[PDB]
Enzyme design. Structure first.
Site, mmCIF file in Angstrom:
data_model
loop_
_atom_site.group_PDB
_atom_site.id
_atom_site.type_symbol
_atom_site.label_atom_id
_atom_site.label_comp_id
_atom_site.label_asym_id
_atom_site.label_seq_id
_atom_site.Cartn_x
_atom_site.Cartn_y
_atom_site.Cartn_z
ATOM 1 N N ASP A 209 0.839 -1.266 0.000
ATOM 2 C CA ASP A 209 0.000 0.000 0.000
ATOM 3 C C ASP A 209 0.851 1.283 0.000
ATOM 4 O O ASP A 209 0.671 2.153 -0.888
ATOM 5 C CB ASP A 209 -1.033 0.037 1.099
ATOM 6 N N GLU B 283 -9.110 -2.399 3.024
ATOM 7 C CA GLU B 283 -8.847 -2.138 4.439
ATOM 8 C C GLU B 283 -9.951 -1.340 5.043
ATOM 9 O O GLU B 283 -10.353 -1.571 6.168
ATOM 10 C CB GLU B 283 -7.606 -1.297 4.621
#
Ligand SMILES: [Cl-]
Lengths: 260, 260
Positions: free
Chosen positions: A52, A164
């Site tokens: 990420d 997420e």
């Protein structure tokens, strides 16, 4: 409307992406934000070696490099921040940094701050579990990146994305504390697709997370793409979804209704 | 609609209030939140001696005490936290604590954490201004309160209200980082009026803020009550309002429009 559909709409996730189009959409967004703010010249981001931050960093660096070129303004800089707690994957972080090749890299060791914080808590008789200390670390990283941004006329990039965000798998005001979210709308495999097209080494995007969640990224991603998954995985995702709603809203006022 | 009217509508401010009704609204809201969440038993709040934390604290204590009484569940507790940086408004905090009479009081000295954070920044060559160190302290206080909440099954109270929110006069993810905002909708004088009805010593609600802002609370409050104020104060308020928008929204995604 099913809950699945409702989640998909809120998080903006497409069933598939054109990776190069999404790279361009992102980079143009990051450039527009910079241009809009007269005093803002830098982006700041913690580089951990995970998928990420690797992707968000590469995109932010690209935005900076293009804007710098368009404007001939050398004040435009990307600031990568290493944030180890003591003696840190150190290897993964170093691969991320070679892939990004940031304008600047700073290393802030968070261990003195974290240790000072825990010491003061334990002295007052507050027990701190490993989970709790984890959240302290994530918040201290936030403080670090904001201090850098505050001194260098920067904005802090966040690495939140749909895979997420759906599970609430971030620390509130921790890694969840940022100014701008370049990856918001992408699921995990979509993020990998972007990295592949950017030329990243397969090590940067090829889990403790899945065991912690009780559900795989493959199920999560499939869910966010509108696919049918097992009942267990579905219930598991919805549980995380209902649990994490306070993380997806501002602090609760007497007017708010989402929590009721 | 004017901008003034639009600010008023967003921040939920009434041109006048019934203080006792507002106390009851707040306490009932705080009790509802606790009852809704099975595992939540405590409220956590930094008690500084200022007006806002004194009022929020008293109301949170009242919500705990009533709920504790209704349920006979002794796990319900209000936790006041003293958060000095080194050797501290010590008198004021003590008057707040006596007025609240909290179920528990903890003292976390933030100096080790803060100093550890600053030293780590300076060691990477990042200069930290007094303003910057101020924001670091506010954020460390947030860390402290969350750590206590995380160990004691608690929620962190925030002291945000309309007269701070309008000027963006809090640190983002600092004193702005909280779970629930009991004072949101009230202006500064309306807070004083609640304190008076609760029986508070006049010292607790009777500066640096107004000089820093370039506009008085009197002007701020009058504005929020739909009154006409001078042009200069008006432009000052609107400047802070526009500047602070990023503090009043979630982190910016590619879908957000407010900043453009
Ligand atoms: Cl928006």
């Amino acid at each position: 409307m099913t809950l699945q559909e409702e989640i998909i709409r809120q998080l903006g996730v497409k069933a598939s992406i054109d990776p190069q189009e999404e790279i361009r959409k992102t980079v143009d967004f990051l450039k527009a934000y910079l241009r809009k703010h007269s005093f803002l010249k830098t982006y700041v981001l913690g580089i951990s070696g995970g998928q990420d931050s690797t992707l968000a960093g590469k995109l932010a660096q690209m935005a900076i490099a293009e804007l710098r070129e368009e404007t001939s303004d050398q004040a435009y800089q990307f600031i990568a921040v290493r944030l180890p707690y003591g003696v840190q994957d150190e290897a993964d972080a170093q691969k991320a940094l070679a892939f990004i090749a940031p304008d600047q890299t700073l290393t802030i060791n968070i261990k003195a701050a974290v240790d000072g914080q825990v010491e003061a808590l334990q002295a007052a008789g507050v027990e701190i579990s490993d989970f709790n200390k984890g959240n302290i670390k994530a918040r201290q990283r936030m403080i670090s990146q904001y201090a850098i941004a505050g001194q260098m006329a920067g904005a802090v990039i966040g690495t939140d994305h749909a895979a997420e965000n759906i599970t609430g798998f971030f620390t509130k005001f921790g890694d969840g504390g940022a100014d701008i979210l370049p990856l918001f709308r992408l699921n995990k495999r979509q993020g990998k697709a972007l990295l592949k097209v950017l030329g990243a080494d397969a090590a940067l995007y090829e889990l403790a997370d899945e065991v912690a969640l009780g559900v795989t990224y493959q199920d999560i991603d499939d869910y966010l793409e509108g696919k049918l998954i097992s009942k267990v995985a579905q219930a598991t995702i919805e549980k995380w979804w209902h649990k994490g709603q306070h993380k997806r809203h501002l602090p609760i006022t007497i007017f708010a209704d989402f929590w009721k």
